[PDB]
Design an enzyme around this catalytic site. Structure first.
Site, short mmCIF file in Angstrom:
data_model
loop_
_atom_site.label_atom_id
_atom_site.label_comp_id
_atom_site.label_asym_id
_atom_site.label_seq_id
_atom_site.Cartn_x
_atom_site.Cartn_y
_atom_site.Cartn_z
N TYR A 139 -14.00 2.57 -11.41
CA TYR A 139 -15.56 2.33 -12.30
C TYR A 139 -15.78 3.78 -13.17
O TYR A 139 -16.35 3.52 -14.02
CB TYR A 139 -16.44 2.46 -11.21
CG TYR A 139 -16.60 0.91 -10.54
CD1 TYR A 139 -15.93 -0.11 -11.11
CD2 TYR A 139 -17.56 0.66 -9.49
CE1 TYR A 139 -16.10 -1.46 -10.41
CE2 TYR A 139 -17.66 -0.44 -8.74
CZ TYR A 139 -16.94 -1.65 -9.36
OH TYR A 139 -17.09 -2.92 -9.07
N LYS A 185 -4.31 -1.33 -0.98
CA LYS A 185 -3.33 -2.21 -1.53
C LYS A 185 -2.30 -1.31 -1.48
O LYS A 185 -1.29 -1.40 -2.67
CB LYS A 185 -3.61 -2.72 -2.91
CG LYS A 185 -3.04 -4.01 -3.24
CD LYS A 185 -3.23 -5.19 -2.21
CE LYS A 185 -2.07 -6.17 -2.25
NZ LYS A 185 -2.25 -7.04 -3.27
N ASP A 217 -6.86 -8.11 -0.09
CA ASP A 217 -6.34 -9.55 -0.06
C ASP A 217 -6.46 -10.18 1.18
O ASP A 217 -6.96 -11.02 1.52
CB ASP A 217 -5.48 -9.81 -1.07
CG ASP A 217 -4.03 -9.08 -0.69
OD1 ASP A 217 -4.22 -7.88 -0.70
OD2 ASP A 217 -3.14 -9.84 -0.53
N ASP A 241 -16.93 -3.13 -3.07
CA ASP A 241 -17.97 -3.89 -3.98
C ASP A 241 -17.81 -5.07 -3.54
O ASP A 241 -18.94 -5.85 -3.15
CB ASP A 241 -17.74 -3.47 -5.26
CG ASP A 241 -19.02 -3.61 -6.18
OD1 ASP A 241 -19.90 -4.45 -5.80
OD2 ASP A 241 -19.07 -3.05 -7.37
N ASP A 245 -20.20 -7.56 -0.66
CA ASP A 245 -20.98 -8.75 -1.37
C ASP A 245 -20.26 -9.94 -0.24
O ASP A 245 -21.06 -10.84 -0.08
CB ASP A 245 -20.37 -9.05 -2.64
CG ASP A 245 -21.41 -8.43 -3.61
OD1 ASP A 245 -21.90 -7.20 -3.65
OD2 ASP A 245 -21.63 -9.01 -4.77
#
Lengths: 345, 345
Positions: A139, A185, A217, A241, A245
């Site tokens: 970001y 990851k 994942d 993020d 959510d």
């Protein structure tokens, strides 16, 4: 306990007031020494100062020991230059205080499993806390850009950024179920293995905490098929993020979710919901999120864990007894807060 | 139909053989003119040619009309240098045949809703197909690297990369329910903007396909709350991994899902599960994903749609009637396949 109250816009002032009634009740009953002051922020501040986070509000945040924030934003200020948008004031608040960790709780209160998208057995017992790194990642990564033929963004993390957020996660786990899952990851990215390696180095300082690693994942899968086995989940900015959510849909309602941002300065607590302008003033806005953020504040900013649990139990009862309209009920803001107070007496 | 079969390691040979019995049965019944040869791949090939994707196999895949791959990987080769690890064989295969679109279907078969972690009302009717970009993204982005103080990786995308995949997605949707949702992170990343922009443009050539855009963190919620409204979902590499693994829980288990890698060369079909080395050669292995992969092949490589539907129905019946151990049952590999074949009539 000095609190700075930034009500914001839309339903912001309604819900913030509901939470204040709760705090004032607790204060009177036990003499907590609560001292609060409300400051203009977001759209409200623009309308009287030209900017969403003016000096009086800034200094107010500084002096306070915690910030109770309502909602911010609304079409009225959507046409202003990015620099002074209501959302930008939120960015300046965090940056001014160096708030690097975002706490996103997700739990299914006993009796409310019916709301969850998950079958009752899966939902039962969910009480997960997601800690997301705020200041770094793709970001804010450099270099970044876009041309006619291609675009690029950089996912970068330094050691200090990973360490500070990792510590918060460990500290929190200590107060809860002493279990931490670090999501990355690492099997495919260098930032992934850098994160994992740094978190394990930090974990050495917390022998009492059980550390686990997972791939983003895979974690997404687990949060849906077995969310109850998780306590504290720590991860990076973009990963946190998506996970936050995703976790937020487990309780089955947006109006029930609070949040916090801890960092170097004054901790900020605010509901996850937006300002819902069209329902503002109508007196039907569910104050659960704002009340729970007050609880989070007692626990986290003031260590009154015992009080936070009580407010939390009362709210649970209120949701079952006199559920708000969004929960298929008819109890408006005031009447709903009354029920909470009834169980708090 | 010329099929190149690459069983691979662990349970790969077992599950692949199950898929072949179904294919042979459809061949005898419908007179399909199937023809196939099995080639060494992964660890199996390392133990005979020193490398995971040897020349004889290369030529074999380049001469067949479709590849039926099994499983790859095993502890026996984990130590070998990246250049020749079984997993690298996949990279080479995809790279050699220019495969850029990875098709991952999550479908809840009627009557199997009970298996899902989601309330039956929300799992009913799910039939989403995630189309993920395989060749680029942060997974292969440059520059990348780490040090003692930090690490970095690059999410980069070029116009041709995005257009190829977007085009496939639209083509799939046309033969499906004419709806596509492109997933990006345009509100924060240049790449997101670049992605949305390019698919948007490509969508213009398909006036009959309804395009919709969503941020990845919002799709994560949508896939859990209302997965039944989605058809084709197109997105990038890592977002595709996360989202495709997420949708896997919807039908029940990840090990039951097939996949197809499409591109310019020979299309590859393989189970999403691992090689499960420790359970190899004992029966018990669930061949559902392998058989469904063969069903995908019939549909995508040969156009035999109704035949694909026929075998999908057969395994759906079989999972209900003779569920394998991994689903709380006793029917091992041979038993389950028998049931499937029983319904192929």
């Amino acid at each position: 306990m000095k609190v700075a109250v930034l009500p914001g816009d839309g339903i912001g002032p309604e819900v913030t007031e509901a939470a204040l009634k709760v705090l004032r009740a607790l204060d009177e009953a036990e003499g907590l020494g609560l001292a609060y002051e409300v400051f203009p922020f977001g759209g409200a501040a623009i309308d009287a100062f030209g900017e969403p986070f003016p000096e009086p509000t800034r200094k107010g945040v500084e002096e306070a020991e915690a910030v109770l924030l309502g909602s911010v934003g609304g079409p009225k200020w959507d046409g202003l230059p990015r620099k002074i948008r209501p959302e930008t004031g939120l960015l300046s608040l965090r940056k001014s205080q160096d708030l690097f960790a975002n706490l996103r709780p997700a739990k299914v209160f006993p009796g409310l499993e019916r709301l969850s998208p998950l079958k009752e057995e899966i939902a039962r017992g969910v009480d997960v806390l997601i800690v997301r790194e705020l200041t770094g990642g793709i970001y804010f990564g450099e270099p970044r850009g876009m041309s006619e033929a291609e675009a690029w963004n950089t996912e970068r993390y330094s050691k200090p950024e990973v360490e500070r957020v990792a510590r918060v996660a460990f500290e929190l786990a200590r107060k809860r179920r002493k279990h931490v899952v670090s999501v990355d990851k690492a099997n495919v990215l260098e930032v992934g293995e850098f994160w994992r390696k740094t978190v394990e180095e930090v974990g050495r300082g917390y022998p009492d905490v059980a550390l686990e690693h997972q791939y983003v994942d895979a974690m997404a899968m687990h949060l849906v098929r077995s969310p109850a086995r998780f306590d504290v989940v720590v991860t990076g900015n973009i990963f946190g993020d998506i996970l936050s959510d995703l976790a937020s849909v487990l309780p089955g309602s947006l109006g029930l979710l609070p949040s916090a941002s801890l960092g170097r300065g004054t901790p900020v607590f605010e509901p996850v919901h937006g300002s819902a302008p069209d329902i503002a003033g109508k007196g039907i806005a569910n104050p659960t999120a704002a009340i729970l953020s007050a609880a989070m504040m007692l626990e986290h900013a003031f260590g009154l864990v015992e009080l936070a649990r009580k407010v939390e139990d009362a709210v649970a009862k209120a949701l079952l007894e006199t559920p708000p309209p969004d929960l298929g009920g008819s109890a408006g803001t005031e009447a709903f807060t009354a029920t909470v107070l009834r169980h708090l007496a």
